[PDB]
């Protein structure tokens, strides 16, 4: 079976919003990101 | 490898990757500027700079 414990996302799940190159910038993107320090479900494989 | 476009701080196309040779190329304005005609009084002469 599997468990259903909870953990903290931290600074995780951030991806590249598009295929646009950007060097030494601070671009702000509105996109479907994983919220920081969010609850992430934990599962197991037995 | 996944990057195709290229931009900068003010959201303008700066560089482009070649879709046929997988090489990079940057983009610059062609010759934009401003023409100012320097001239003495037209009652004096007609030559201009």
């Amino acid at each position: 079976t599997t468990t259903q414990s909870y953990t903290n996302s931290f600074t995780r799940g951030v991806y590249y919003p598009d295929k646009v190159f950007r060097s030494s910038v601070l671009h702000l993107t509105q996109d479907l990101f994983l919220p920081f320090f969010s609850n992430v479900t934990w599962f197991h494989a037995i | 490898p996944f990057q195709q476009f290229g931009r900068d701080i003010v959201d303008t196309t700066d560089a482009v990757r070649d879709p046929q040779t997988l090489e990079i190329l940057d983009i610059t304005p062609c010759s934009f500027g401003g023409v100012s005609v320097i001239t003495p009084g037209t009652n004096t002469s007609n030559q201009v700079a």
Side-chain angles (χ1 to χ4, degrees):
Chain A
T1 58
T2 180
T3 84
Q4 289 245 9
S5 48
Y6 270 48
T7 185
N8 263 357
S9 76
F10 315 118
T11 45
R12 198 59 67 160
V14 161
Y15 58 94
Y16 292 79
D18 38 47
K19 296 177 198 250
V20 162
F21 189 83
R22 255 176 291 256
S23 164
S24 266
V25 310
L26 266 307
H27 188 217
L28 167 66
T29 69
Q30 190 271 335
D31 207 284
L32 291 88
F33 287 102
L34 169 70
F36 277 178
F37 308 95
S38 161
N39 291 337
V40 201
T41 43
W42 189 326
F43 292 87
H44 269 83
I46 294 113
Chain B
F2 66 96
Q3 300 259 56
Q4 285 321 110
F5 220 46
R7 280 186 201 268
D8 75 287
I9 305 104
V10 287
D11 214 20
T12 76
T13 82
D14 162 48
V16 289
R17 182 196 278 284
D18 189 348
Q20 205 138 297
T21 72
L22 281 193
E23 92 184 301
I24 72 164
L25 309 143
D26 41 347
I27 308 193
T28 313
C30 47
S31 72
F32 155 74
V35 157
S36 71
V37 166
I38 311 196
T39 175
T42 207
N43 78 317
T44 292
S45 161
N46 269 7
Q47 335 197 331
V48 299

